[PDB]
Design an enzyme around this catalytic site. Structure first.
Site, PDB file in Angstrom:
ATOM      1  N   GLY A  59       0.808  -1.220   0.000  1.00 13.15           N
ATOM      2  CA  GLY A  59       0.000   0.000   0.000  1.00 13.15           C
ATOM      3  C   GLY A  59       0.837   1.265   0.000  1.00 13.15           C
ATOM      4  CB  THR A  60      -0.096   4.858  -0.563  1.00 10.78           C
ATOM      5  OG1 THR A  60      -0.962   5.246   0.512  1.00 10.78           O
ATOM      6  CG2 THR A  60      -0.935   4.455  -1.781  1.00 10.78           C
ATOM      7  CB  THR A  61       4.379   5.877   2.444  1.00 15.59           C
ATOM      8  OG1 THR A  61       5.157   5.094   1.528  1.00 15.59           O
ATOM      9  CG2 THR A  61       5.122   5.973   3.778  1.00 15.59           C
ATOM     10  CD  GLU A 104       3.272   7.450  -1.718  1.00 12.15           C
ATOM     11  OE1 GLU A 104       3.889   7.564  -2.797  1.00 12.15           O
ATOM     12  OE2 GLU A 104       3.633   6.664  -0.815  1.00 12.15           O
ATOM     13  CB  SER A 124      -0.619   1.679   4.291  1.00  8.78           C
ATOM     14  OG  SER A 124      -0.213   2.962   4.731  1.00  8.78           O
TER      15      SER A 124
END
Lengths: 250, 235, 244, 231, 111, 241, 195, 243, 240
Positions: free
Chosen positions: H29-31, H46, H74
């Site tokens: 996943g995104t940070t 993010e 995330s």
């Protein structure tokens, strides 16, 4: 969630074996030896208190249990399974008998109820069988003294004397030689101690042996006086000291 | 083994796709919609000559203004018919009117995907639902076990279907009379049937605004079969 | 999830058999032989206990023969614990009928209800069947003396003479040979013991390995009595019929 | 592969294959396009027939006076989810006398879809949805995936060969976003976007479905003769 | 003891002409001897060229009208925007009312 | 191979899922130790805060179950907190129903019964934790009762749990073989804690700073845990002897 | 409804039941048959609350007919009466009890005896030589106590019945519009269509 | 083998592989990060710009629980939403019975126990998210991070998603080079930087930054989104640092 | 409750549990029904591996559902008891509510519905039973004979057979039964039924059961000797 195991986990195999019951009996075979002997004026049940570590206080672990004032139980196999069966057995002695008839059940009927519980764990959904065999000793007015074995399948049988667990085959042989229909309770205790010594590896004393009797009424254990007809429990657990006393004349 | 509600890697429900195979094994049913009525015809397909063929009931009334024919596992159709009749009668009780053919069809199709671990599997039967209502006139629908339904000017289901459907592609046009439609159903049934078509092993029905849903007697269908023989033995 | 561990106890094989019922019947074929014989003046139930020990208390033991009511008894072959579940259900059914109609339950009606219960476990619920076959011996005023069997499939049938458990093929052949319609109870007793004596896997047949019972009109004036034999009484009948 | 038998199972790389297979049903669905200005939002959908005797499957469903959607994939799943939306719009009106914000509708759909991806016996929904609406904060377009992911967009497309339309809209963004107060131009641009996904077939009068919602325009669907003007 | 009903007064009148219909009602709302409002409208346009008034206990009246309008909306969804005829509305309202046969809407309804 | 996955018997009468739950018990790589004084019960546990981004005040495997009962857990933190919440609910309910505080051994039995059920019922997994309950019981005095994933439980003079439990155990046995009594013959809990830390140091062959330990103390009518600074004071007195 | 009488003679049971049905102010019917045949040799007459009487009687009839088919056997009158009693005893502690009183007249083919059972709505069962429900016994029992013999013929039973109905017609305030009489014996059930 | 096919099964090493597979979805996943400051907490994340067609500022990922708790996660976004909905029910019921808004450590255990429950049965799947959350209560600021196993601890700073390694290192520096404290306003700027630095490992797509905070002095102990000028400022601080 | 879908489609569109239920019917003892001009006859085989059987009390193979309708079957005996009980309860329920006994078709439609329901319900297997249902509608003299099977499909038959070797006896009936000329008498129809069974049965001993059903609730089972007379009379016409 919700329990979605609503199907049997014990089933017949092509040869007619109920696998889980056989495997439960195998767990009992590994168990520490326990035995019972019926005398004319009592019953004795005994087993080894095999302590897991010497830091363990082994008196806090009761292998022999009072079920009613006149009925006691010992086991071989899985201790935790035994502990919950004792809780249920004590409760069913009340809910399905004492609250109805105002008296404790006779030995065979309590055995029958325990057996039913163990049978249901062999057919009901989402459970395994209990991995224990029980020896239940007791007295009641119309049947006198009796001794029963209960197995993982829910089958029960009455014995004059028997043993279960580890060294049962040898112990049963020892018991066939010594048992007769004229034994007094002290003779039966003495035989129990002799039999038990064979299957016990190391220390053999009052602190490593658990032994109880179903014998005479103990009015000193009743807790109150003044009702002639209430005469006290027939179940008594022998003390460490009482066991060691009998280990000298051994 | 594997869940009843599982998708395949191509994005299709296994059980629905398999029930579609069961429908291809079913006896042929055909319906044709015209501005004068909708005709519904079926292949009875008796499994033995001792079977009394008039006890084979594959065309069924749902209400006065709606009929239906089935193909596939025909025993699975009974509860769908029961539901359809109940929905049609119920709507009339609640609204003092006839229920639209599409709404009925939609109600039947809502049952379709109600399966899992509700019923244990999809239905193994396809339906042609024919009828008339005031808003949209004469209509024919094809209700599948996937829960999808398509409107059709003409449609064939069952074992002889893509042979029959190719044939309906050719013959259907907007100005078909009811009588032409009847002969056309008979003609195409005769083509795709294994045994020889007659009034005992095939059955016709129609739905008109005036007279509602009617199943034809064997005598009336016999007449139409003879008429069909004569038209074809004439070029 | 849980589907993975489901044996599916209630499905047909490709041949149209119920696996679990077949395997339960296989289990039952290793149980002690039980025999029922019907006479004009009564019924005998005889059964062989499972390979004993000298320390087993016989006189207080009951593994094979059970009283359902005053007019009906059963002999058991298979898992004893499974049998006790069903026996208590049958006892309750008998009392429900008596309470409702003020008449003792006809033998067949009791047998049908127990068999219907067994059947249910083979069609729905996903549980294993009961590993038990019964022989029912009883009396009522419609059909008189009656013998039935039921097995894990929940099928039941009536008999003049029947065996369940081990060596039924051999036992059935022997009963087929010596059974006669005009036969009386005291002959049927002898036949049952002789049949067990020949079919047993033990070296010889003795009192401590048997359970025995009769249902007789042998009770002062038009009425029926059940007799579960004490161990001493089995010892006497073994001598009397010249088997020991 | 050993991990795709049900929705309750992660693969060793952390994927949910039953959900991905549900996503695959959308890719097979007929193309549908959505786009909006600041005043209006438009859905265009290519309807697919079974053969030439059959009708063209309807792709656009009205949810409320100010909201509606188009579908690609399993149509019965769209019927379930759109029915749920109708109820939620309805609940908001009856209880709070308030029109349901398009963003809330997206959150509710996400949560409904999610529950079918985490429990035994369920299956994911096998349909993708494009939701347009006009509410108190203007025009909106949402994309719903059956994984539960809902996204607010200026424009998009889903279904077979949506990629063509999706790039066209990406180029035209700065132009079509400014089409305020001119409904016909916004539709034109949507019809042009969906044309980039056509091969073999072309837009005909029983083939094309258009819906529009905006400032002083209740959600309305155009089919048949009513789309002649735009082909 | 709690009385779940009240009386909000009001009078309504519906007359059917040859090719028209009128439904009238006063706009006063009362409890006992007090005026709650001199203008609380009581006759409503329910869509599909149907007007409705449910007079008596106003909370029940509002609940009914509000359920009926809802029923018109769902009729459109479920039956392809088919117009709900007055006879079909009448039959539908009977079912709304009879559904509370044992705890009635305390109103006299006219459409 | 499905007798390996759920709690049914293997052909040798074993429950593999229970055995593998015992293995999860050492995942944290922490050792703990419990001993009894005259008037008190002491439990110590290694504290390891490997990441610098952690708030070390929130890193703990010792729980205050009731005012009198403390519990230390050997196993993963989620299963530990599951057991901790349950024991808190059980102890509070017991007090409400029966009008007196739940004894340490009774709570241990109760949690052991719950564990037994998970070994018999297929739909529940065993918890991969070992629970050591401590108190000064009003009837039995200083008490240590320990429960495991098999549903076994027993009382202890002293006990240890973790990867190096055997070294600590033998060390403790040897002391009691000497002293010939059931407990540490010491008046103050401070001195019993010092004994506990000292014998862990010898048995593990490692030295501790104030942040490397966790200490719980049970006295008559309350169980409490020591702060880093109370532990420092303990460490200092140990060094100066 | 109102009057139901029963009398057991040597070889049969006779049940007499009034014909009137009254809804408050009007007599709606003067030819109502207040009885159901439960089996070929068992008859039940009934009286009590409107609706409940017929619902109960038909429910009992359905159950006995079901038993007969399942077993291919006719239950004894005693067994039928015990079943009926249990149902009424069950009903008296229900949410809304059956307020229904019955007489069961049967010929037992096994014992070759006629049998009459009187059961009230509480489930109070009694076997009697003759019986009634409501106020009927108050006017008729003194005649039956006087004239009844256990060895009477069917015709003597009917004559004693005429005497009972005549006393009712004299001293009862309600006009019950005569009675329908039915006889239960070894050959089954028949109606006496002149009374 | 086959131990990894079913949730709640212990492997022979004592592991639940289905939970470890859930972590893979989180790592994909995104940070997202959280920084604890002197009197509050800051959350940042993010958001990958998949296409120009995403409306900027309009797909909000950070979520409020009650009025004083922020949550960011995330992995599988819908799993995160499901967890927050449960969190909101738990906060509502706590406040209903006890009046006071739920303390952060109390709230953490509520989520902990719920996530842990989804590792007890094969009939459910573990959560495919790591969740960073926290806020201000009557004992000060608290920052927690919760994993798919149900495991959680309190943190000084925390990070999860694809850029978790980069962000951790950045967080470790702040902790060392500010042993006495970090102000809420500083933390907002630092949060922007660390996300920009962590975005290296998701470089193919450009992104949108999103920040929120609860501070006793800056927000009155309520959770608010960093919007407008203050957001732009922190974006600038971050842009200057990557050059 | 136990919920498993046991009856499900296979890739070729077959439901195997329903098909395997038919295999259980194939293994069951043979049953045949033949309808005359004013009667229906139901004949059943009894497997002859069992003597020492008490036939007084043993479950008979033809069951009365009501006084005017009967049911016989092939397949699992225990399964058939469940259908028979349900059918008997429904017959009394119909009389109670409609005030008329069931038509033969209605009763068939009911039993067939029960069988179908057990092919798409969770946690149940299909009935391993096919039935022949025979009788006369109330106040009607036209004979009725229906068949049901595990799938739940049902239909009317002039004459029909089920169970083991039913292919052989269906062969027989297909060439020995004339639609134009139904067995005009009881004697004639019973004979054709007995003949069809003798194609397959073995000994004509107590191996054949016969039941005759006439209009207006006139149903009677023939006993051994009465059937024996038909057997005797048939071989004496064979040697020729």
């Amino acid at each position: 969630m919700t329990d979605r195991y609503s199907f049997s986990l014990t089933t017949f195999s092509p040869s007619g074996k109920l696998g889980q019951i056989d495997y439960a009996l195998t767990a009992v075979k590994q168990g520490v030896t326990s035995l019972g002997i019926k005398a004319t004026n009592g019953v004795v049940i005994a087993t080894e208190k095999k302590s897991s570590s010497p830091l363990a206080m082994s008196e806090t672990l009761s292998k022999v249990s009072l079920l009613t004032p006149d009925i006691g139980a010992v086991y071989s196999g899985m201790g935790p399974d035994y502990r919950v069966l004792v809780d249920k057995s004590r409760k069913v002695a009340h809910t399905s008998y004492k609250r109805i008839y105002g008296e404790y059940p006779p030995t065979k009927l309590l055995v029958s109820e325990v057996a039913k519980i163990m049978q249901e764990a062999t057919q009901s959904g989402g459970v395994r069988p209990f991995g224990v065999s029980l020896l239940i000793a007791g007295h009641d007015e119309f049947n006198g003294f009796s001794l029963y074995q209960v197995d993982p399948s829910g089958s029960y049988f009455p014995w004059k004397a028997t043993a279960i667990g580890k060294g049962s085959v040898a112990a049963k042989t020892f018991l066939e030689k010594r048992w007769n229909d004229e034994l007094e309770l002290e003779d039966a205790i003495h035989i129990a101690l002799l039999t038990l010594k064979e299957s016990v590896e190391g220390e053999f004393n009052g602190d490593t042996i658990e032994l109880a009797i179903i014998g005479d009424e103990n009015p000193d254990l009743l807790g109150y006086t003044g009702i002639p007809t209430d005469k006290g429990p027939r179940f008594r657990k022998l003390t460490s000291q009482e066991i060691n006393d009998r280990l000298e004349a051994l | 083994d594997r869940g009843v509600s599982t998708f395949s890697p191509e994005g299709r429900l296994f059980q629905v796709e398999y029930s579609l195979e069961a429908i291809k094994l079913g006896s042929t049913a055909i319906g044709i919609a015209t501005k004068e009525g909708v005709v519904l015809g079926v292949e009875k397909r008796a499994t033995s000559p001792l079977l009394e063929s008039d006890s084979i009931e594959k065309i069924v009334e749902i209400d006065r203004h709606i009929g239906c024919a089935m193909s596939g596992l025909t025993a699975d159709a009974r509860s769908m018919i029961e539901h359809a009749r109940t929905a049609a009668v119920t709507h009339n009780l609640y609204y003092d009117e006839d229920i639209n053919v599409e709404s009925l069809t939609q109600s039947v199709c809502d049952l379709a995907l109600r399966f899992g671990e509700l019923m244990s599997r999809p239905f193994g039967v396809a339906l042609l639902i024919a009828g008339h209502d005031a808003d949209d006139g004469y209509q024919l629908f094809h209700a599948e076990p996937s829960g999808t339904f398509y409107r059709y000017n003409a449609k064939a289901i069952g074992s002889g279907s893509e042979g029959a459907q190719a044939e309906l592609l050719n013959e259907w046009h907007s100005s078909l009379t009811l009588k032409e439609a009847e002969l056309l159903v008979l003609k195409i049934l005769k083509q795709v049937m294994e045994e020889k078509l007659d009034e005992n092993n095939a059955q016709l029905s129609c739905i008109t605004k005036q007279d509602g849903f009617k199943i034809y007697d064997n005598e009336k269908t016999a007449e139409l079969i003879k008429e069909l023989k004569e038209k074809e033995a004439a070029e | 999830g849980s589907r993975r561990y489901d044996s599916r106890t209630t499905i047909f094989s490709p041949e149209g058999r119920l696996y679990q019922v077949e395997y339960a019947l296989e289990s039952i074929s290793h149980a002690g032989t039980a025999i029922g014989i019907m006479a004009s003046d009564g019924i005998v139930l005889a059964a062989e206990r499972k390979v004993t020990s000298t320390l087993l208390e016989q006189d207080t033991s009951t593994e094979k023969l059970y009283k359902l009511n005053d007019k009906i008894a059963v002999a058991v072959a298979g898992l004893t614990a499974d049998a006790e579940i069903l026996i208590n259900t049958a006892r309750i059914h008998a009392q429900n009928y008596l309470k409702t109609y003020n008449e003792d339950i006809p033998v067949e009606i009791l047998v049908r209800r127990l068999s219907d219960i067994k059947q249910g476990y083979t069609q729905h619920g996903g549980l294993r069947p009961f590993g038990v076959s019964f022989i029912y011996a009883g009396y009522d005023d419609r059909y008189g003396y009656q013998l039935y069997t039921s097995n894990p499939s929940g099928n039941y049938t009536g008999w003049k003479a029947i065996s369940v458990g081990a060596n039924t093929s051999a036992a059935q052949t022997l009963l087929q040979m010596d059974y006669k319609d005009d036969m009386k109870v005291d002959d049927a007793i002898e036949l049952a013991l002789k049949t067990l004596s020949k079919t047993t896997d033990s070296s010889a047949l003795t009192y401590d390995r048997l359970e025995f019972a009769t249902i007789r009109k042998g009770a002062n004036d038009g009425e029926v009595y059940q007799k579960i034999f004490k161990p001493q009484e089995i010892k006497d009948i073994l001598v009397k019929t010249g088997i020991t | 592969n050993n991990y795709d038998g049900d929705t309750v199972t992660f693969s060793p790389t952390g994927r949910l294959f039953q959900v991905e297979y549900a996503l695959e049903a959308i890719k097979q669905g007929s193309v549908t396009v959505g786009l909006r200005s600041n005043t209006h939002a438009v859905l265009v959908a290519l309807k697919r027939n079974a053969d030439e005797l059959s009708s063209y499957q309807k792709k656009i469903i009205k949810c409320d006076e100010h909201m509606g959607l188009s579908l690609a994939g399993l149509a019965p799943d769209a019927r379930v989810l759109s029915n749920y939306l109708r109820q939620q719009c309805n609940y908001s009106s009856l209880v709070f006398n308030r029109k349901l914000a398009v963003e809330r509708a997206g959150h509710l759909l996400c949560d409904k879809a999610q529950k079918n991806t985490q429990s035994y016996g369920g299956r994911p929904y096998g349909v993708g949805l494009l939701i347009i609406g006009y509410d108190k904060s203007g025009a909106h377009l949402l994309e719903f995936q059956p994984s539960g992911n809902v996204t607010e967009l200026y424009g998009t497309a889903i279904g077979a060969r949506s990629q063509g339309a999706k790039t066209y809209l990406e180029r035209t963004l700065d132009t079509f976003i400014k089409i305020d107060g001119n409904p016909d131009e916004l539709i034109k641009a949507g019809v042009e976007a969906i044309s980039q996904s056509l091969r073999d077939e072309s837009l005909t009068v029983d083939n094309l479905s258009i819906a529009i919602v905006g400032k002083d325009t209740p959600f309305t669907i155009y089919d048949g003769e009513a789309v002649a003007k735009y082909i | 003891q709690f009385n779940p009903y009240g009386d909000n007064g009001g009078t309504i009148l519906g007359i059917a002409g040859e090719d028209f219909a009128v439904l009238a009602g006063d706009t006063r709302n009362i409890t006992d001897y007090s005026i709650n409002s001199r203008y609380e409208p009581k006759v409503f346009d329910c869509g599909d060229n149907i007007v409705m008034s449910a007079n008596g206990f106003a909370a029940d009246g509002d609940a009914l009208v509000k359920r009926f309008k809802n029923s018109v909306k769902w009729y459109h969804f479920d039956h392809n925007d088919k117009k709900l005829s007055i006879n079909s509305a009448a039959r539908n309202i009977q079912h709304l009312l009879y559904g509370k046969r044992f705890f009635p809407y305390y109103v006299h309804t006219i459409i | 191979g499905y007798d390996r996955h759920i709690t049914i018997f293997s052909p040798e009468g074993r429950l593999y899922q229970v055995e593998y739950a015992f293995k999860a018990t050492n995942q944290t790589n922490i050792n703990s130790l419990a001993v009894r004084g005259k008037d008190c019960t002491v439990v110590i546990s290694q504290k390891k805060v490997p990441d610098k981004l952690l708030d070390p005040t929130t890193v703990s495997y010792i729980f205050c179950i009731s005012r009198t009962i403390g519990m230390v857990v050997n196993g993963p933190i989620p299963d530990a907190r599951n057991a901790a919440l349950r024991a808190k609910a059980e102890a509070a309910e017991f007090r409400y129903k029966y009008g007196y505080d739940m004894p340490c051994d009774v709570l241990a039995k109760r949690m052991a019964n719950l564990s037994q059920i998970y070994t018999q019922r297929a739909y529940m997994r065993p918890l991969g934790v070992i629970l050591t309950f401590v108190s000064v019981d009003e009837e039995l005095g200083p008490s240590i009762y320990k429960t495991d994933p098999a549903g076994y439980y027993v009382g202890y003079k002293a006990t240890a749990t973790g990867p190096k439990q055997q070294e600590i155990t033998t060390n403790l046995e040897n002391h009691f073989k000497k002293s010939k009594i059931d407990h540490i013959n010491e008046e103050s809990w401070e001195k019993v804690v010092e004994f506990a830390i000292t014998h862990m140091i010898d048995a593990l062959g490692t030295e501790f700073s104030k942040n490397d330990l966790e200490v719980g103390v049970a006295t008559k009518d309350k169980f409490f845990t020591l702060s880093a600074e109370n532990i420092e004071e303990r460490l200092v007195a140990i060094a100066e002897q | 409804m109102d009057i139901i009488l029963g009398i057991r003679v040597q070889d049969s049971v006779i049940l007499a039941s009034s014909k009137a049905v009254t809804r408050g102010i009007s007599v709606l019917k003067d030819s109502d048959d207040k009885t159901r045949q439960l089996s070929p040799h068992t008859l039940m007459s009934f009286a009590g609350e409107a609706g409940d009487t017929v619902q109960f009687a038909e429910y009992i009839q359905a159950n006995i007919q079901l038993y007969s088919i399942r077993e291919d056997y006719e239950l004894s009158p005693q067994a039928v009466s015990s079943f009926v009693r249990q149902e009424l005893a069950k009903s008296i502690r229900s949410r809304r009890p059956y307020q229904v009183n019955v007489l069961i007249g049967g010929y037992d083919k096994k014992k070759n005896k006629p049998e009459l059972y009187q059961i009230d709505y509480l489930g109070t069962k009694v076997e009697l030589p003759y019986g009634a429900h409501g106020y009927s016994g108050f006017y008729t029992f003194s005649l039956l106590d006087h004239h009844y013999r256990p060895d009477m013929t069917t015709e003597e039973g009917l004559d004693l019945l005429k005497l009972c109905v005549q006393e009712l017609e004299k001293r009862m305030p309600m006009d019950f519009k005569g009675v329908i009489v039915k006889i239960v014996d070894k050959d089954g059930i028949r109606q006496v269509d002149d009374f | 083998t086959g131990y990894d096919l079913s949730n709640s099964v212990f492997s022979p090493d004592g592991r639940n592989f289905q939970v470890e597979y859930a972590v893979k979805a989180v790592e994909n996943g995104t940070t997202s990060i959280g920084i604890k400051c002197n009197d509050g907490v800051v959350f940042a994340v993010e958001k990958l710009i998949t296409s120009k067609l995403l409306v900027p500022q309009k797909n909000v990922k950070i979520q409020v629980v009650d009025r004083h708790i922020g949550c960011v996660y995330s992995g599988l976004i819908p799993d995160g939403r499901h967890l927050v909905n449960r969190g909101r029910e738990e906060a509502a019921s706590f406040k209903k019975l006890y009046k006071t808004p739920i303390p952060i450590p109390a709230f953490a255990d509520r989520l902990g126990q719920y996530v842990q429950a989804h590792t007890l049965y094969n009939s459910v799947r573990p959560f495919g998210v790591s969740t960073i959350f926290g806020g201000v209560d009557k004992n000060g600021a608290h920052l927690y991070m919760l994993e798919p196993s149900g495991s959680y601890w309190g943190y000084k700073g925390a990070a999860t998603g694809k850029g978790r390694q980069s962000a951790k290192a950045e967080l470790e520096k702040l902790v060392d080079h500010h042993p006495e404290g970090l102000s809420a306003r500083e933390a907002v700027k630092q949060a922007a930087k660390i996300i920009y630095l962590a975005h290296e490992d998701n470089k193919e797509k450009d992104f949108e930054l999103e920040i929120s905070w609860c501070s006793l002095s800056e927000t009155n102990g309520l959770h608010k989104f960093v919007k407008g000028d203050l957001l732009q400022e922190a974006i600038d601080f971050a842009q200057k640092e990557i050059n | 409750g136990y919920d498993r879908a046991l009856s499900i489609f296979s890739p070729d569109g077959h439901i195997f549990q329903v098909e395997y239920a038919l295999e259980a019917v194939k293994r069951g003892t043979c049953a045949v029904g033949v309808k005359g001009k004013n009667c229906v006859v139901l004949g059943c085989e009894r497997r002859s591996t069992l003597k020492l059987q008490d036939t007084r009390i043993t479950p008979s193979k033809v069951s009365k559902i009501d006084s005017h309708v009967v049911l016989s079957f092939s397949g699992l005996n225990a399964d058939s008891r469940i259908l028979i009980e349900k059918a008997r309860v429904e017959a009394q329920s119909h009389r109670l509510t409609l005030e008329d006994p069931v038509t033969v078709e209605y009763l068939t439609r009911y039993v067939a519905g029960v069988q179908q329901r057990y092919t798409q319900s969770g946690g149940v297997r299909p009935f391993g039973v096919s039935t022949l249902i025979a009788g006369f509608d109330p106040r009607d003299d036209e004979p009725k004979l229906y068949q049901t099977e595990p799938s739940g499909i049902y239909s009317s038959w002039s004459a029909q057979t089920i169970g083991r070797n039913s292919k052989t006896v269906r062969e027989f009936l297909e060439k020995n039964y004339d639609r134009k000329e139904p067995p005009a008498t009881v004697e004639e129809c019973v004979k054709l039924t007995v003949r069809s069974l003798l194609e397959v049965v073995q000994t004509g001993a107590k191996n054949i059961e016969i039941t005759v059903v006439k209009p207006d609730s006139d149903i009677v089972a023939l006993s051994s000797e009465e059937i024996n007379q038909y057997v005797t009379q048939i071989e004496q016409e064979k040697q020729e």
